[PDB]
Design a protein around this ligand. Sequence first.
Ligand SMILES: [Cl-]
Ligand SMILES: [Zn+2]
Ligand SMILES: [Zn+2]
Ligand SMILES: [Zn+2]
Ligand SMILES: [Zn+2]
Ligand SMILES: [Zn+2]
Ligand SMILES: [Zn+2]
Ligand SMILES: [Zn+2]
Lengths: 142, 23
Amino acid sequence: DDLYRQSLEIISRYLREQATGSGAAGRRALETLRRVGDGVQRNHETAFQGMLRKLDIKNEDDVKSLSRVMIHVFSDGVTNWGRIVTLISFGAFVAKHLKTINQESCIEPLAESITDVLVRTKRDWLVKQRGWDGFVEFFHVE
Amino acid sequence: RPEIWIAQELRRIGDEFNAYYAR
Ligand SMILES: [Cl-]
Ligand SMILES: [Zn+2]
Ligand SMILES: [Zn+2]
Ligand SMILES: [Zn+2]
Ligand SMILES: [Zn+2]
Ligand SMILES: [Zn+2]
Ligand SMILES: [Zn+2]
Ligand SMILES: [Zn+2]
């Protein structure tokens, strides 16, 4: 499952970079995600903080609530890349929090949960636009 | 309610951010 694996790689890498501080298509997607994932947090820091508090994530594995949230976000039937990147960015915000409380925390369950929602529930929507190419082009700046 | 509150805010921000880049 190339799309799942590619997506998980991009999302896992971003979450890990965010939480710790520390092919080419996947690379361009990750570069875009760094830029706009960081971008969407800007101005929304208070909102993200408030969401994190309500989310009340218990540990690295406690992803069920976030998954329900993500499914609910999409439950109006609208799908776009702004929503998707906001969910990933919030995921990174949550991952950063999990590491802050326990530095031995793995971001992997969170990244897998996010990727699951995106790839399983929007599979064909992603495939029709050649996956992450839609993301790269949507957020492409000249 | 908490999950719905979180989802409402994520959707608002996502759609905002989408419109920003769609423009
Ligand atoms: Cl589902
Ligand atoms: Zn880990
Ligand atoms: Zn692990
Ligand atoms: Zn795993
Ligand atoms: Zn392209
Ligand atoms: Zn609702
Ligand atoms: Zn709703
Ligand atoms: Zn609000």
